[PDB]
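Honest question from a wet-lab person: if I give you the sequences of every part of a complex, can you actually get the arrangement of the whole thing, not just the pieces? Trying it with mine:
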Amino acid sequence: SERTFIAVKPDGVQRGLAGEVICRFERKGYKLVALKMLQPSGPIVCMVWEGKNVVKGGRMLLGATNPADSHPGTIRGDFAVDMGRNVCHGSDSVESAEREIAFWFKADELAC
Amino acid sequence: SERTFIAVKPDGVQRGLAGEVICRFERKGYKLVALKMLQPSGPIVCMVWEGKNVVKGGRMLLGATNPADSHPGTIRGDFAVDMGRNVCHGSDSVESAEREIAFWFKADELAC
Amino acid sequence: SERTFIAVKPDGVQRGLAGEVICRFERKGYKLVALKMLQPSGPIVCMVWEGKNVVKGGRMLLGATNPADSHPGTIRGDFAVDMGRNVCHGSDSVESAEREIAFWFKADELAC
Amino acid sequence: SERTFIAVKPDGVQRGLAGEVICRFERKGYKLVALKMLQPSGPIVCMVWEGKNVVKGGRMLLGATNPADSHPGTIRGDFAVDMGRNVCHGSDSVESAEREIAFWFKADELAC
Amino acid sequence: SERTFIAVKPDGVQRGLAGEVICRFERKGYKLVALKMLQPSGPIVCMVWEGKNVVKGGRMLLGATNPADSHPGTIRGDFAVDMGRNVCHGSDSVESAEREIAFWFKADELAC
Amino acid sequence: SERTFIAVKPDGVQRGLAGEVICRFERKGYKLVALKMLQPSGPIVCMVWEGKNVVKGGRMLLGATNPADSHPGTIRGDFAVDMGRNVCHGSDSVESAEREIAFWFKADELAC
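Yes, you can. This is the full assembly:
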């Protein structure tokens, strides 16, 4: 029952693939426990997912940060052309998730 | 540039298919202009989509309200077992969208 | 909790799409309660699915018997070229399911 | 072994979905017997497909010409926002296919 | 023309993804030469696939045994949360396949 | 704005997966700037794609040349059984692309 924070950035959002991102985390077995879109820069989509090992799990679904090293099968592998146009972020530890979760989301918005 | 309101209801959400719903509206060409998840009953996901003819458009993606009449290819066709366990709602007119958009979303949350 | 019988016929099986068939019934919410493949003519795959309204449900996933009338979104719509090369069968009533279930499957094989 | 002519028009091509179109005709069982892209207006992708009943078959995969009437599961259902932004064409008869095939393709390009 | 044994375990089966598994092996080019579901613990789905190099092939489709090391694109990558909740098994050699094939399947059930 | 040359070879083409190939390059963000099919040996489909880093990009979508080493998520991973029956080719450098582009395509056919 850890939790992690994922966000889909503007270009990602202009391309139309938070659906994709959500589908992959759903498919992998994680519960979506919060989500919202935020307006400006560029709009972004913030999410929080919960599951056994979801922080390491989530980073693996996303693929390597550097899209030039990201393998097919991951989000960055399948979708992202350049590190700027990577357009996705996930927490890198259980510690940083909590900072990101608690910064971006009112607790009323999360789901226990 | 009309707009419509779509929502994915609890069981829908327990099954894991707002990704699916979002992917179909993305794929169809509509801009997602707001979205958030709301906690209790059961949690729900509210969205607003914008495009030429999106209110009639959106209802067609969803399929007939009565899942016993919903054809494959639509969300209710592909996913929903019973009218209770239909678990999806879309505005039925441009008029009702505005009531639903303006009830469920602060305008800061929408995107002009 | 009705049940129905579905079968994927030889050409269907030479084309490689019992996966597809199973995925659509899974996606729709039905429990797979038996399944096996049978060898000769041509091999075939027999299945039994269970759910609210699954007999009418299942026929709708399959699409119209006459592939010339089958719409996209259904199995026959998406996959089948001719009525011979339709290659799929589903029960047409709750009555005929039981004859088909109980003929093709030992009860040890079904799952209560 | 009829044949038909399909073409994916500029916006279609700017959106990135001749893959989709080709995948659906492949999936349905038709042989692709010619194909090429043509540059200007806007670029377009011309194809020829062959199979039992492929002219009526192909129009059905595409869905109704008027995207406001096109059901989900078809290309126009799933992808096209307006009749201008429909962006796809298929032959309406065995007669018109031959005019379209023989106009757009050198016979060296087709495949017997 | 080697053969291998694959099985989808209970939780896998409660989640609804033998379709997925079958689709990936079909897509990869392997012939499905036997298959059946078995009832209790938890029900399971046994399969046998045949093709050039299918034993090493099949393990690669499944991904690393330890779901914490399984990359996206594989079954365990895309679907499995924990090593218990990995829920899939494939033969590790041509030798062990034969033990698994011949244990789990009557030869009448296989297809030469 | 580099460019690369991709080609789908006969068996690939008999299996029906230039759609797949095109869909993956589209999905990854590359512009398709030329494409055509060529008749005999076996027919083949030639394409040219353009984007930031598309030559290395394209080889990564295809996966390792030796299908016995190709991971799931790539084309060769997901689809190809043997190195002969690999059936796909992509340029290995910006230099070799230009030789392949300029050999296989009249410049009228490319798109600036």
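Two things worth pointing out. Strands of chain A lie at 3-8, 31-38, 44-50, 89-90. Helices of chain A lie at 10-15, 18-28, 54-62, 75-79, 94-104.
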